[PDB]
């Protein structure tokens, strides 16, 4: 049924993402979400694919939804901060990278981001 099929779609999406097939990844994750809309990982993965396509608004929306489902999803904050930085929403980006560091203090991407964003906030 739907939940099990949703996971197969996620796996196909992951393989597409690993092969840099960002649009095919979006398509599979979109089907995964249609089949099961209550899994934060599907939204967070779809945000990842959207980032590589420079679909920053869609990435941001997916990250916000992922957080609604699971507020401790670290990658949702990293990805949303990335999108927000692209969209020159620097204080919001810095807030997301700061939250990622609350959840995961050793995260190097987020540490690097905070240093870079100081000049804009």
């Amino acid at each position: 049924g739907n939940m099990e099929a949703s996971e197969v779609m996620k796996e196909k999406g992951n393989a597409a993402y690993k092969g840099k097939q960002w649009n095919k990844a979006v398509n599979f994750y979109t089907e995964a979400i249609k089949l099961n809309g209550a899994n934060a990982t599907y939204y967070c993965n779809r945000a990842a694919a959207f980032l590589e396509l420079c679909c920053f608004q869609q990435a941001e929306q997916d990250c916000t939804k992922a957080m609604l489902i699971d507020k401790k999803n670290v990658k949702a904050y990293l990805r949303r901060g990335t999108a927000r930085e692209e969209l020159v929403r620097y204080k919001e980006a810095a807030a997301d990278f700061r939250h990622a560091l609350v959840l995961e203090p050793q995260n190097k991407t987020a540490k690097v981001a905070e240093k870079r964003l100081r000049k804009h906030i």
């Binding site: 992951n14 993402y17 993965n45 670290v74 990658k75 990622a100 995961e104």
Partner: peptide
């Protein structure tokens, strides 16, 4: 830990 470039 959390590699942004990897999906889950």
């Amino acid at each position: 830990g959390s590699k942004m470039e990897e999906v889950d």
